[PDB]
Amino acid sequence: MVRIYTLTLAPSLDSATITPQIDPEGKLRCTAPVFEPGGGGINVARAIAHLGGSATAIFPAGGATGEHLVSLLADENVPVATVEAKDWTRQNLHVHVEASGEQYRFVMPGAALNEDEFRQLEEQVLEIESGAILVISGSLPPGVKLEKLTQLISAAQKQGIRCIVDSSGEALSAALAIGNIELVKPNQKELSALVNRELTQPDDVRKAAQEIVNSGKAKRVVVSLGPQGALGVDSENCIQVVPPPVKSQSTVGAGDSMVGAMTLKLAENASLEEMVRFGVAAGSAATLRLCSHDDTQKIYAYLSR
Amino acid sequence: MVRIYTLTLAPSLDSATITPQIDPEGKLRCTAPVFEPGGGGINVARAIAHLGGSATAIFPAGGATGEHLVSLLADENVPVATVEAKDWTRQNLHVHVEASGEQYRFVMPGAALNEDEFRQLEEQVLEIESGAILVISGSLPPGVKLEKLTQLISAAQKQGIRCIVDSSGEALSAALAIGNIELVKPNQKELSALVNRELTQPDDVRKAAQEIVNSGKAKRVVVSLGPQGALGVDSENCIQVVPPPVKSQSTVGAGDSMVGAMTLKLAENASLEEMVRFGVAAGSAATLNQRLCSHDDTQKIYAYLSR
Amino acid sequence: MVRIYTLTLAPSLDSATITPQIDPEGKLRCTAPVFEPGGGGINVARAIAHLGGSATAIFPAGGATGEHLVSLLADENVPVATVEAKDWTRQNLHVHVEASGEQYRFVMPGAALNEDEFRQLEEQVLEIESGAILVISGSLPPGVKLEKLTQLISAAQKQGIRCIVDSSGEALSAALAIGNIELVKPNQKELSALVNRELTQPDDVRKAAQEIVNSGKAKRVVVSLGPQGALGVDSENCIQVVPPPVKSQSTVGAGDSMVGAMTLKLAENASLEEMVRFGVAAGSAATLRLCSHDDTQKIYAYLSR
């Protein structure tokens, strides 16, 4: 198996707090927050650790929040490589409401990155050995032009770095601009936005995914379909894998868990079918903070029936 | 093709209205109601009509609301057979909230049936010829014992009427009490209650469905799974059908549409696979717009599922 | 004291039901409804009965719902005079949500009235003896043109019937069109709509109310101000009465209770001050289905300190 790294341009120190009620106008008294590592590539790395593998998380860190984010990851035994940033690591807020048992997630943009920090992030990435896998996951923070994302991925690819991309909107297009991307995991929304047309017909998602493979923009496209699972596309195969008929308790961390699972499968040179199954297994395991090894194992064995 | 009848012991004259915002305390000013046919078996009969089929809807009807329910179905070319009830046909409320674009459905019990009005309904049911299909769908209204429902199904079965059941709670249990139902469509919640245990493992739903078949309660169990489609089970077969990757705009009224589709397939003696696929096609067709499934959407999805 | 009658052009059989949760999309299973008399003039009459007086409620009734509405009022010992209508008496739905303890009120328009029923309603009103008081309260149902409301009030007034009006929007203007109205109780919204300008300045409400008295459109204008009470205006006096600093548990039935109280005071030829105080007392008592005699008494004694 090859080495795995992730990149999170917009990391977060996520604070989880509780309040009895949610209602407008008044003050909602919240408990003192419990902190946790936030960000796409970061969660992908944590999911990989849950699933037994190892992934180095690359990201910018600033202020005492950044230091706290780095310290959480140390406690969870996830390797990191950071560049210090001027703007302090931002905080997303997850609020649990007692009276309903429900969660609310307020996701702000990440901290800003100036030209210089991005170049430091690029230097760190180009340190990755050839053949190794890099998962670029999450949104694009303020201060980064889309052309700079494209240049990073080209640069990485020019020296044998295998690139996996999970992102949104123009950031996704910027990633696929150069092409030869190893793996992309848009959900439905991200797919419709990337292709710029509504996906209203039964075969629309498949045709759109197949187009991306055929145009060479990506070697593999896995479209995640929430409860319906995921549809995966090669130059060779096309496959849909549906999760077990089991009730979902939350949505949090499904995408990143799936991406981590599929990354571990890609690194192991598994078949397209193995990869999507393991991805759906981990994605759905997370819906039962992320995916556990035993839950993923159970679901993967069932799909592998 | 055999004849198809549906039974709705608790029909409804539902009102669809629009209000700008939803919030407690204040008066929520609602637009003039737009009336629509309500009830399980009624909507199964409406879906069958849309799918180019035909089914006679048997239901009680009382008062000006009863008359408007009947007249609504007349305008839809849905054949009916009604019994006049003393208590007025009830009205559930469907509220569209402009601000969020959301819909709320407030579902109240059906009007009461006295024992005479029930007797007339069973009499209409027992006029159905042997070999024809009867779909019993929806909740049980006040004034009817559970035993009355079981006795009705036993009597109909005794004269060769093939029964399809869609219900919940204690009513679903009692429909399955004497067994030999042709087809039941529980969702995940209804299957769990029916079998009286948690379905949390990957293979539980399938096993729960098979258990109902092996016990003789039903020849066919199709567990509907919302966006995950459906898991259909036979004495010989088991198939899951997943709908196409198209997002849904609503959930009303997907269960009834599916049941309408599968009843039609049953009337055609189609294989289990075709029944379930056509079920998912119609159900998912109904989710495509915020009343039921249409012929063309269903055909489109079914052809995709059959490819 | 003179005799009191009310008129409700848009009556309602209100059904109150309970559900554990309120949420979009799914089916909200509601208990079998508990029915209660709905409509402005109807509630005004019930409030008058609670406060010891007697008021005859005039309204159209149709279908089994109308019959049920009539039967509820019989049980509460409120006199009625009905005309039978073709369109069945409509049902507004009040939903109590267990998980929050909150109420939601869905108010549809009343049943339609054709030309003929309205004339029957007019005939019933013109049967009222001269000098007696008629409270016209509530919204205008489908099938009634605003000119017909105006004609009814003129007709009533032409033969000594004392008219009190509580309504909304154009219906309110239609009422004041003829002028010499005994008493109007707009709230803030209704006042701003009646006068057609935003009431943004401190003295705006008073000036607007005073204008109506001075123009002769109404002998008395009481603007209700929710928790701030009510501001009442004569040709002579101008007075604001504020409720006791007591927490409010619900809003339901505040306006109608206030109007009933003030009607009883008007019938007793009380001063403007007595009238508004008793109105605020009953209005606020209701916020603690309507106003109780003891609660109103308590608050009225406090205001009368």
Add this chain to the structure above:
Amino acid sequence: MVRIYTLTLAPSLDSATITPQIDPEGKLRCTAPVFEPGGGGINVARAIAHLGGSATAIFPAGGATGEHLVSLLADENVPVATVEAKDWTRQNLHVHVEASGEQYRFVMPGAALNEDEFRQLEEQVLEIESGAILVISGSLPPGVKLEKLTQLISAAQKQGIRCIVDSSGEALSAALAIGNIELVKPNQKELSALVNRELTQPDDVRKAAQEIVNSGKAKRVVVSLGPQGALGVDSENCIQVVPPPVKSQSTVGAGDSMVGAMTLKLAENASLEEMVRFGVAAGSAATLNQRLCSHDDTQKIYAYLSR
């Protein structure tokens, strides 16, 4: 006019953001935060500035967030006196929901203060000269004993600093423990808890307020009543002031504005009536827009109340 100082043991760097809709489960995408000064005594000092007065805000500040809180107040010409804390200044979240136009405020505890950082804050407080006014407003942060707050008020009083208190829970009780507070502004909830009983009768709030005065805990009790205005109580007087019949757009941050107004009146030795009227004027001025009271709106309302 004497000098005015405020104390905020739990200041905040609050972020105001906008999201289209609010609902559980999904990610609620929020716009880039817009930062604003948070904290009781800070906002009292900001309101005083708006009202054309001057007050020095004493508070702890840590990290880049602390620096931005300080810089925000600099841009507002609010004099400050800060103590550097180790733990970073916290951030509450204010969320504007476009769909409904509503605002949600998620209010978390202030950053911790160690005993040394508290010592420095008291040292800054005790540099205030006799006869000057100190407003202690807001919650108590972690790491501070209730006794530390009481000792601070006793020490300040001992050297002639006139103290105004706005707080809640156990902190408010302890501020009133040694008595002789110049002015406390509880709302209805805070008054009820403070006196530890239900205020349900018409005359209860007034009696509760008078009880606090007669006990010596405070010379002036002004109970704020939301839209009903305020009930101010003295050893000699009692006055309720109701705001004008103008609807409010927000409730943020009406309490602090009122306190700022009344502090200014106290510094002018105005009668109780003028203090309360000016209090309601500023408080209600702040409710006129969705940050605090403005000079012109306050003047307008006060002139109306004084007519």
